[PDB]
Amino acid sequence: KATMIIEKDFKIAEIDKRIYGSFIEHLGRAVYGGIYEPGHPQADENGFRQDVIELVKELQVPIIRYPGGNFVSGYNWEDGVGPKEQRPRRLDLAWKSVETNEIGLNEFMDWAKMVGAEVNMAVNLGTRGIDAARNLVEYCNHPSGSYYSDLRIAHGYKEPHKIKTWCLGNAMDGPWQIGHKTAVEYGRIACEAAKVMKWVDPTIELVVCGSSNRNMPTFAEWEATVLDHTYDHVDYISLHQYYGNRDNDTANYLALSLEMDDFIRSVVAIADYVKAKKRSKKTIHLSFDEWNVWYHSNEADKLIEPWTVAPPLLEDIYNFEDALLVGCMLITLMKHADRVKIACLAQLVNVIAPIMTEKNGPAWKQTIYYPFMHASVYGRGVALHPVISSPKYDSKDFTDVPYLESIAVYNEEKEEVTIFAVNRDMEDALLLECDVRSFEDYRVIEHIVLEHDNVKQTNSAQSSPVVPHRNGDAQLSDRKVSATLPKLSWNVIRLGK
Amino acid sequence: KATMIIEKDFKIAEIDKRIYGSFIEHLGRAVYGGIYEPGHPQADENGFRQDVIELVKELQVPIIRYPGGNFVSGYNWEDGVGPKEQRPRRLDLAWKSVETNEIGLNEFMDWAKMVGAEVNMAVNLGTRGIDAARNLVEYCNHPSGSYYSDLRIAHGYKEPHKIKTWCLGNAMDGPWQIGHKTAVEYGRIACEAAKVMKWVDPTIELVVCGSSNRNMPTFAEWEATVLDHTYDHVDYISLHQYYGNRDNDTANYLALSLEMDDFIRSVVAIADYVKAKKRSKKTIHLSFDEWNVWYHSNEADKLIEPWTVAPPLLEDIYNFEDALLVGCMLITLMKHADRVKIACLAQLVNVIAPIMTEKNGPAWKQTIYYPFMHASVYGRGVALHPVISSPKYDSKDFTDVPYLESIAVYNEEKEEVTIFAVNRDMEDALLLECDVRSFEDYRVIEHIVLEHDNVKQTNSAQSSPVVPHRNGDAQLSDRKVSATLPKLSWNVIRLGK
Amino acid sequence: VGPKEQRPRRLDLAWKSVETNEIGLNEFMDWAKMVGAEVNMAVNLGTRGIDAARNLVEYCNHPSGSYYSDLRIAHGYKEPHKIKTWCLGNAMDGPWQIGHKTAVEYGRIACEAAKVMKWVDPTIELVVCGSSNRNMPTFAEWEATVLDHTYDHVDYISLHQYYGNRD
Ligand SMILES: O=[N+]([O-])c1ccc(O[C@@H]2O[C@@H](CO)[C@H](O)[C@H]2O)cc1
Ligand SMILES: O=[N+]([O-])c1ccc(O[C@@H]2O[C@@H](CO)[C@H](O)[C@H]2O)cc1
């Protein structure tokens, strides 16, 4: 048995819809054979797969980070614009692939328009620096009357792209990165790039890069130093986290969102330290601009020979337990809506992705597609503070793990309240009771449930045994929602009227 | 009108009673003519003023920091123990006074026993270091069978003092401090002192010093560096704040607790940054070990000639608005009960103090005595998260200042809820409505009010025009407590059942 | 040193023991003479520093005619001990050590101690301390920094190793 109070007046914050963002890199088949496949029977006039477009639209992803990721740190943006005959073939050192540049930034912008997403554009601060950063902002955002703006027009794009949010490089702390920089070296170049970008277009916002991983030896130290160098000139700091179940311990695996919670709290603390050090009135928020499960494909990738075009890298096939953890991660983002304003599921198509494609063949929804879709579609509004009383368990790496992971979101315009809830219990149902006295005249619309008896079950092109159903038993009586949350389940309880 | 939800299940934390601590330094008349005055008519067998003892007991102060403060940084603890004829007269460079050492640590411990307080003992890390720190802990806490423990016994104190909580120096970031140290120098000596102290007695806990003032050029940087050097070896970081009304702006003055709130949040953030950097499982908490109003006596002190014994320094005479600000500071401490575990009103007797004495004469209660007493007496339990809707104003230095400053404290053992509330409005009463649905069968016990028509009115030995009354109108009807909070008032609304 | 009744009982924080000081350096020298060994004497560079280092070398090695040499004589040891080889502290890179010092802090105090010790008695030689363990995070870095600070003034660098068969 668990209880919850859902009080309209106990609020975290309005949820920024950009927490339901995603990310496409020039990596593997994310672009080539993912969003773009000129051969394909379902390709549009520009070569974009229409089936993939529909699948992304249904997720209602508001913002997509591009073009990297590790790729960007060795990339020259000019190589991907202008007539195709003049675009060079390059060695991408990030993913040991040949990049044809058949898709570059203007074609990506065309695709993003089709799916209804804005683009969070990254600049290269690995091999390049401040001059290229200002020039790219000018190219994309300045209307006309300068060399680079008139160049964009000549390339066929009269109106500026007007990109709002930009990433200052990719995480550079990683010794695997092209043009690795220490926190001081990065903080300095990011500061100077931020300035010139903002001078070209003061309407932009900037994301400064945090650590590649919470496990880096420089974790926390990095963020504090980088913010000390950049605070006045930037708007967000990023964080990145990938999880996996490499020891087949489901109870411990589902608890990993507790670590994510502490991780967010730690980076918020660093931002507020530096705010105080600077005596600034501006608050810096978080961009959780890579997050996902990533581990299934690690061994397969080791067999791929270098210098092919569009190798099948990072093609994790997700299972049901991966979906539960993704649900827990989503709820964790919502619970930090006050300070996490952007987040990006890494990545959107083929590469550690909720959408998978086959050459000349179908596109399909992985298990993780469903909780992401439900969060994005039903998770707009104000995140309410969870007062939860829940039974708890201990695992290898965590103590006092609540069986219930939940939050409610109130949308005043739609007059809806949605309760997202994971039951982590591997054996028993959890009887949830929610005090909803603060909302008058509400009823249960539906109770969606994602569950499967085998946590290792996957979806595929041919069959999808892991799919939601609408037979949850939530009922609302004398100002109390009572709902049975099945063992190992993701639940979306929708209230309205 | 203002509203407030008093929800039992929306909790901040259990209040550590040590947030109602105080502080006595060898400064002015705090010791000599304050707690200790041989031949005063109310002096006991050991020369301690009984009237002061009774006044301190009524405040229920659980812990008292001693002996400094700036004094400790030039003090040799051996100078204050053993037979009086062998105790040297010293020049105290902190307060430009001659210190006779007629009172030293063992006599202070005797006094502390009379008022029922434990002592938060500070070690000198200005002119002294790690050897003196281990020796003092041995002297105080080791039972017997070593030179320093047997020395304590020979000085007349068979049983060890068993001091739990120790300060590693006094703030020495300040260029006015004896033996100023940079953050690195201080962090290093504090680290090595902490270790040897703990090796003498592992039951102790340690407070590492924060900045002298939030306005120091090294604020925030200091705390981060000091914790980086000491984290594994210490338990708390300190913070210090004094306020004054030097431009006669009451509306701006009463808003200052908003700054105190930001200040605490900033130091918490620093502690959590360093925790993440170290990958520690230990949370460091805060000791707000100097706070008060301090400004009235600044000009008078400039006329005192150096090298007298017990000069009348820091003798602020508090007024009614000062008591309102102190009330707001107390509520702010309670609002941070989750992370502020020790706090010390600086100071307890004569020196910026709630209790004042006259030579061979009376002891009396300053205006600020009353809100401190009420907080300490009625503010034990769990601090509840305030959910308030209040009208607001702007002042010189602050925006959106709520007219209402309030919190509720729930004592389950006493079956009581106490609402502390200041109305900052200089013209209008505030009609407070409190939702108490979650406290069924609770009734109003009493409504205490501290108010005076003249914010500049003081108390004195001869008369106390500023004193609480019990004519508050709080009343319960239909699960709602409604109370009129007069303009410029401190209110204590006690509920029970 | 000196009469036993004036020797204090101390808390030894290293091994969490009470040290009575019933044996001190002069008695140890008497023992060493019986087994035919010279003594490699260590000075405290944890809680103490350069003054105590010069004074101890004077006490042990200076013949007579100064306070500390005449003190040794008064304690019953007319002839100086004439200790050749001295350790500048014990390894203090370790967070378990009393008065831990960074490599720079240690290098500096060891340098200044070495100088005054040698000025009391130029016949001595000095050992500067290496890491407590090869597995310390500061291994190798430590030795390089410490020698950079002390090279001209010292004769040896130390190293320490313990083994076990715990699997
Ligand atoms: O933890 N790791 O092993 C790890 C490895 C690679 C890594 O790179 C990030 O993930 C890649 C895929 O999204 C992006 O290009 C890059 O920014 C981030 C983390
Ligand atoms: O901001 N200031 O002006 C200021 C002035 C003095 C000051 O010292 C502190 O306040 C003294 C009195 O409680 C204690 O001895 C010392 O720790 C701390 C701050």
From Swiss-Prot, chains A, B:
SUPFAM superfamilies: (Trans)glycosidases, Glycosyl hydrolase domain. Optimum pH is 5.5-6.0. Induction: Transcription is repressed by glucose and by the binding of AraR to the operon promoter. L-arabinose acts as an inducer by inhibiting the binding of AraR to the DNA, thus allowing expression of the gene. Strongly inhibited by Hg(2+). GO terms for cellular component: cytoplasm. Pfam families: Alpha-L-AF_C. Keywords: Carbohydrate metabolism, Cytoplasm, Glycosidase, Hydrolase. The active site is at A171 (proton donor/acceptor), E290 (nucleophile). Alpha-L-arabinofuranose binds at E25, N70, N170, Y242, E290, Q347. It catalyses: Hydrolysis of terminal non-reducing alpha-L-arabinofuranoside residues in alpha-L-arabinosides. Pathway: Glycan metabolism; L-arabinan degradation. Gene3D superfamilies: Glycosidases, Golgi alpha-mannosidase II. Its EC number is 3.2.1.55. GO terms for molecular function: alpha-L-arabinofuranosidase activity. The record marks W294, Q347 as: Important for substrate recognition. GO terms for biological process: arabinan catabolic process; L-arabinose metabolic process. Optimum temperature is 70 degrees Celsius. It is found in: Cytoplasm. Involved in the degradation of arabinan and is a key enzyme in the complete degradation of the plant cell wall. Catalyzes the cleavage of terminal alpha-(1->5)-arabinofuranosyl bonds in different hemicellulosic homopolysaccharides (branched and debranched arabinans). It acts preferentially on aryl-alpha-L-arabinofuranosides, and is much less effective on aryl-beta-D-xylopyranosides. Belongs to the glycosyl hydrolase 51 family. Homohexamer; trimer of dimers. This is Intracellular exo-alpha-(1->5)-L-arabinofuranosidase. It comes from Geobacillus stearothermophilus. The gene is abfA.
